[PDB]
Ligand binder design. Sequence first.
Ligand code: BCL
Ligand SMILES: COC(C)(C)CCC/C(C)=C/C=C/C(C)=C/C=C/C(C)=C/C=C/C=C(C)/C=C/C=C(C)/C=C/C=C(\C)CCCC(C)(C)OC
Ligand code: HEM
Ligand SMILES: [Ca+2]
Ligand SMILES: [Ca+2]
Lengths: 66, 84
Amino acid sequence: KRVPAWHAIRNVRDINIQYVEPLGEVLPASRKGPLGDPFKVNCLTCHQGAYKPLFGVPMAKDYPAL
Amino acid sequence: SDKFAGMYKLWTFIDPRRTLIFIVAFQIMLGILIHMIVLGSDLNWHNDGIPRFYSPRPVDVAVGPAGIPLEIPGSPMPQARNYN
Ligand code: BCL
Ligand SMILES: COC(C)(C)CCC/C(C)=C/C=C/C(C)=C/C=C/C(C)=C/C=C/C=C(C)/C=C/C=C(C)/C=C/C=C(\C)CCCC(C)(C)OC
Ligand code: HEM
Ligand SMILES: [Ca+2]
Ligand SMILES: [Ca+2]
């Protein structure tokens, strides 16, 4: 289980550097913090206290848009 | 030869009570030890399955491409293993 976590780190950096932080131009002042940056993603943003998000039910295969 | 004829005199400076106690205790200790050493071996006779096995036999679990058991897709706890 150490080897997926190693990739997870890199993955999260991608989500925050390429996508979520550049959205700080579009969102209103409601979605920002004290220092003026938007909300970002953690390990807890999808696991939410479980060893796999939603215990690992494979939802994404049914939708060819994703 | 006749050189051992005076060995009984041993008991005039070595006493019977302590000697008997030591001997008996040591023999029981040795008995238990040798039975346990032979049990922990290939010569084990309780678990050999001769003349027949009496308890159910172990069943292996299939592994994944990472060499550990597969996770079950809605279990609220991960799966156990004993080897890492
Ligand atoms: C499958 C059977 C097991 C075995 C299972 C047990 C168990 C279980 C016990 C013993 C016990 C004894 N065993 Mg045994 N024993 C084995 C093999 C041996 C061998 C050997 C050379 O292979 C020897 C020397 C012994 C010796 C002994 C004694 C130390 C001890 C007897 C009590 C005592 O106070 O002894 C003093 C007496 C002597 C030292 C003389 C006895 C030696 C005997 C006759 C061994 C001869 C065997 C050997 C093949 C002879 C080769 C010579 C010639 C070619 C014929 N065993 C094999 C591996 N043995 C018992 C014990 O510790 O009680 C307190 C005990 O509970
Ligand atoms: C009243 O009567 C009087 C008193 C006057 C007369 C009495 C007469 C009588 C009854 C006398 C009786 C006399 C008796 C019974 C005498 C018995 C004598 C015996 C049996 C002596 C045996 C001696 C054995 C010896 C000294 C062996 C020594 C072995 C040594 C030191 C080995 C060392 C080995 C090493 C260190 C190797 C290590 C190996 C390894 C690999 C495990 O180490 C890491
Ligand atoms: C840095 C934080 C993260 C860590 C340390 C992390 C760690 C892990 C680990 C170790 C696993 C494998 C679980 C297992 O097999 O027992 C896993 C699975 C998973 N994670 Fe993450 N994760 C993180 C962030 C995320 C994020 C943000 C998401 C959502 C975008 C996510 C989605 C998933 C999914 C869907 C799986 C299941 C994949 C599978 O079935 O093998 N993780 N994560
Ligand atoms: Ca990318
Ligand atoms: Ca048997």
